[PDB]
Design a binder for this molecule. Structure first.
Ligand SMILES: *[C@@H]1O[C@H](CO)[C@@H](O[C@@H]2O[C@H](CO)[C@@H](O[C@@H]3O[C@H](CO[C@H]4O[C@H](CO)[C@@H](O)[C@H](O[C@H]5O[C@H](CO)[C@@H](O)[C@H](O)[C@@H]5O[C@H]5O[C@H](CO)[C@@H](O)[C@H](O)[C@@H]5O)[C@@H]4O)[C@@H](O)[C@H](O[C@H]4O[C@H](CO)[C@@H](O)[C@H](O)[C@@H]4O[C@H]4O[C@H](CO)[C@@H](O)[C@H](O)[C@@H]4O)[C@@H]3O)[C@H](O)[C@H]2NC(C)=O)[C@H](O)[C@H]1NC(C)=O
Ligand SMILES: Cc1nnn(Cc2cc(C(F)(F)F)ccc2CCC(=O)N(C)CCOc2ccc(S(N)(=O)=O)cc2)n1
Ligand SMILES: [Ca+2]
Ligand SMILES: [Ca+2]
Ligand SMILES: [K+]
Ligand code: NA
Ligand SMILES: [Zn+2]
Length: 805
């Protein structure tokens, strides 16, 4: 109930929300159906429109007008935005040459440069170039400020998850807004774009920027705008708030536009109808900037122009229907569209079985345009599993397609030509970032980056301490002139043991065999030196990774590779090796096919055994340092040490062997050598974080050998590929992966073919950031380079996406 009898006189767009039943005058009152009776009259004036004209200049103030052109308007803070242009001979901001903003030029009483976030829904990255001719204000922001060629959204590439990620620095699985539509089984409550349940605070986790600000003494504008408030009024409101007394005036503001998304759904991303929405947005930017210039704030305020996600061509005819795959389609609930999420229609149906649903949706039609996953099997880069609002069964939909339950769902709702939501590496989903102001750099292009990083930067811009988030603070320091955040590397928690030869061969009863009994002071000293670390400089190029948790592990050195061997998990945490451009691939010799050798530096008690693999009919093994890339026949024996062995399902060995035998040499050839760090990952609870020993759900049968959920590799070389990876003077180049350790290749519909036709495609799907691997392992890489730490942080957040431009 609302007592709409109260009044908005002197309260229009008040910043403090009043409580029911008292009536509201804030920028969301329309959305709650709670505005006072005179809100439209007082707060949504439209008379005479939004622009001064020559005949209005110096007029007698009429308080009815939407904006003013009277002499007093500048002191009142309520001129139309083009007042000084029309009435005082000034230029539009867009017509002024850009001039570097080396220091804030702020009026007296300003404690810090304000931040204005100008957010645009559905603004596809390529609009910045494709639309540049009709967007002059935006193009001036872009060219004169700091810009990225694109900014990567979060998955799913929907509006609410992305805007809340921008605001919090959190993945959707952590902030809780995992879709525009959601069911929470604990609450037994549904969230929708339309309706009142979304207003309940229990949905919204983490701490958004406006709360972070307020908690730390920095006043914020209200970020949200009811749809019926025209854009011109949103801009005038912001400019009026900026004219508040010092003690009342906010330091951070947002503008939101529902365009170009609204038209893009109707017309497709490049429909000829899209030019006009782009022009209108540019006009709005121009109003803001002219308005700021009038207030002498255009060289004081930091402006961020940012989007939530892009827009793809999608039409009704490109719809897959689950009714063409499932016998039982009435027994499921589907969240449909550009992603699918499936759960049981009834929790009382004991015949519901996810395994049967997954199998019925797997590789059934030759051109099938979606792929089913249990959520824990989704690419780790999506960070889309650790929330009870995310259904166990997920459908990843191909770009340009939809999934629906039945045909009647699609003609009882054609119309639309655009949509979004797909995998966040898809080029059409990419969006925009421009920063302009005293704190941003001048005429600077920065590489693409993820929207999860911006919360930290916005905090930097306002002098706030960020709440805990998924950004990597410092990785965006290169966007900033000042206010950089200078982190220190984390302290190493566990120091390594460096074992020597401590065990005789006969102390081992592992059930392993090897034909290695064939035998010199020249060369014996030389191999002892290899075991003491004499080649380590060649193979450990960026220092040893640091272990950031308490554990017991050994550094093991070899001619061709170095490893950090966990006594607790009975395998390496990491294995590091360098392959030059000139390296040769060789075979596993016949006489070594089933060779596994005890490691006399490591106790039988802290070793794997071959008998467990013999007895586990489902599980085989592979090697972290590949025997195919040994430097010599004698060095190859090291690759068959029990301390280099890891548990691998036969189906996965197909993938791993092809990576090791073919792809590593290919990358070394293409990149002028590579350094490879490979290892296991354990994430049985799919939280993106390293499992403890007591979280492990599967072991090699009858043993204490844990089974990894994933295998990673980090592949590093010189950005300047004219220098070899082992003699690189400058910036680095990286690509990495986190491959799911699955007992089948059902993910890959073409896996019956030669690995040349499917393995690399699998690997591209499971591309990762070094930072993702850090979270999953508790390791900290690149500790010893010649590079700036912030540069290394940028490198750790890089994602190799495999998309063209
Ligand atoms: C991305 O960045 C984020 C932010 O840094 C990372 O998320 C953090 O990860 C930590 C570990 O997973 C986690 O720490 C836990 O906090 C628990 C207290 O949590 C509440 O308070 C905080 C602070 O205000 C708040 O932020 C939390 O918010 C979550 O929950 C609400 C719902 O109430 C949601 O609205 C909100 O969206 C958010 O949900 C998300 O996180 C939760 C987990 O907290 C998930 O379950 C959701 O799916 C969703 O992803 C909370 O309101 C604290 O109780 C935990 O302590 C247990 O574990 C420690 C281990 O040190 C153990 O010693 C303790 O004994 C304790 O165990 C006991 O409880 C167990 C479970 O009931 C039980 O099994 C035991 O037997 C014990 O009784 C823990 O410290 C931190 O909360 C989140 N924060 C956020 C914002 O998500 C994220 O990891 C990063 N991602 C990556 C990939 O790097
Ligand atoms: C989602 C989301 N997450 N964070 N924001 C705010 C925001 C952030 C940012 C960021 F700076 F981060 F880029 C920019 C702009 C906004 C405002 C968006 C807005 O104005 N829209 C989308 C129309 C009304 O939307 C409502 C949504 C919920 C309620 S609620 N909570 O009352 O149910 C009301 C209105 N929106
Ligand atoms: Ca959107
Ligand atoms: Ca985990
Ligand atoms: K076996
Ligand atoms: Na297959
Ligand atoms: Zn949309």
């Amino acid at each position: 109930w609302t007592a709409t009898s109260g009044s908005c006189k002197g309260r229009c767009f008040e910043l403090q929300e009043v409580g029911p039943p008292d009536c509201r005058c804030d920028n969301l009152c329309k959305s709650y159906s709670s505005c006072c009776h005179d809100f439209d009259e007082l707060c949504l004036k439209t008379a005479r429109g939004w622009e001064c004209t020559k005949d209005r200049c110096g007029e007698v103030r009429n308080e009815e007008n939407a904006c003013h052109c009277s002499e007093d308007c500048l002191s009142r803070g309520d001129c139309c935005t083009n007042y000084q242009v029309v009435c005082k001979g000034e230029s539009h901001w867009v017509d002024d040459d850009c001039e570097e903003i080396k220091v804030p030029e702020c009026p007296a009483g300003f404690v810090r440069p304000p931040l204005i976030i100008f957010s645009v829904d559905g603004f596809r990255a390529s609009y910045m170039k494709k639309g540049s001719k009709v967007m002059p204000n935006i193009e001036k922001l872009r060219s004169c400020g700091t810009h990225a060629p694109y900014m990567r959204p979060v998955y799913p590439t929907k509006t609410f998850p992305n805007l809340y990620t921008l605001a919090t620095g959190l993945y959707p699985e952590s902030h809780g807004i995992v879709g525009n539509s959601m069911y929470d089984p604990v609450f037994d409550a549904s969230f929708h774009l339309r309706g009142r349940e979304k207003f309940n605070h229990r949905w919204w986790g983490g701490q958004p920027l406006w709360i972070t600000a307020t908690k730390q003494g920095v006043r914020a504008g209200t970020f949200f705008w009811s749809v019926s408030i025209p854009h011109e009024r949103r801009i005038l409101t912001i400019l009026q708030w900026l004219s508040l007394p010092d003690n009342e005036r906010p330091s951070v503001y947002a503008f939101y536009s529902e365009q170009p998304d609204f038209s893009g759904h109707k017309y497709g991303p490049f429909g000829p109808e899209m030019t006009n929405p782009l022009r209108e947005i540019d006009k709005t930017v121009g109003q803001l900037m002219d308005g700021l210039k009038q207030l002498r704030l255009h060289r004081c305020v930091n402006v961020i122009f940012v989007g939530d996600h892009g827009m793809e061509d999608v039409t009704c005819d490109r719809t897959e229907f689950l009714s063409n795959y499932l016998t039982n389609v009435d027994d499921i609930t589907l969240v449909p569209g550009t992603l699918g999420r499936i759960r049981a229609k009834s929790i009382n149906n004991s015949k519901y079985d996810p395994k049967t649903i997954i199998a019925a949706l797997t590789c059934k039609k030759p051109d099938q345009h979606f792929k089913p996953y249990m959520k824990q099997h989704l690419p780790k880069r999506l960070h889309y599993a650790n929330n009870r609002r995310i259904e166990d069964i997920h459908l990843l939909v191909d770009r340009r397609w939809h999934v629906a339950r039945k045909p009647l769902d699609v003609y009882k709702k054609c119309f639309f030509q655009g949509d979004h939501g797909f995998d966040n590496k898809v080029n059409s989903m990419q969006t925009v970032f421009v920063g302009y102001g005293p704190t941003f750099k001048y005429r600077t292009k920065v590489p693409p980056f993820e929207n999860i990083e911006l919360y930290n930067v916005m905090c930097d811009l306002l002098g706030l301490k960020p709440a805990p988030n998924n950004g990597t603070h410092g990785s965006l320091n290169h966007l900033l002139r000042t206010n950089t955040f200078r982190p220190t590397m984390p302290d190493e928690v566990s120091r390594p043991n460096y074992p020597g030869i401590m065990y005789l061969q006969s102390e081992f009863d592992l059930g392993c065999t090897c034909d290695d009994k064939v035998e010199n002071k020249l060369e014996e000293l030389n191999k002892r030196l290899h075991t003491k670390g004499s080649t380590k400089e060649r193979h450990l190029l960026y220092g040893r990774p640091a272990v950031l948790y308490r554990t017991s592990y050994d550094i093991l050195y070899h001619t061709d590779f170095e490893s950090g061997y966990s006594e607790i998990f009975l395998m390496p945490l990491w294995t590091s090796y360098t392959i030059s451009k000139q390296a040769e691939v060789s075979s596993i010799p016949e006489h070594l096919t089933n060779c596994v050798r005890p490691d006399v530096r490591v106790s039988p008690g802290f070793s794997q055994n071959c008998l467990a693999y013999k007895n586990d009919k489902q599980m085989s093994y592979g090697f972290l340092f590949p025997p195919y890339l040994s430097s010599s026949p004698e060095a190859k024996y090291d690759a068959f040490l029990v301390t280099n062995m890891v548990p691998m399902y036969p189906a996965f060995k197909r993938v791993w062997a092809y990576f090791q035998r073919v792809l590593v040499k290919k990358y070394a050839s293409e990149r002028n050598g590579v350094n490879v760090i490979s290892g296991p990952i354990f994430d049985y609870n799919y939280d993106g974080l390293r499992d403890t020993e007591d979280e492990i759900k599967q072991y090699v049968e009858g043993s204490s050998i844990p089974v990894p959920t994933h295998y990673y590799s980090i592949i590093t070389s010189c950005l300047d590929f004219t220098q070899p990876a082992d003699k690189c003077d400058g910036p680095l180049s990286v690509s990495s992966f986190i491959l799911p350790h699955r007992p089948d290749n059902d993910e890959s519909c073409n896996s019956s073919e030669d690995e040349s036709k499917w393995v690399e495609e699998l690997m591209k799907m499971h591309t990762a950031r070094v930072r993702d691997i850090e979270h999953l392992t508790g390791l900290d890489f690149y500790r010893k380079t010649s590079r700036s730490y912030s540069e290394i942080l940028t490198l750790k957040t890089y994602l190799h996406t495999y998309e063209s431009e």
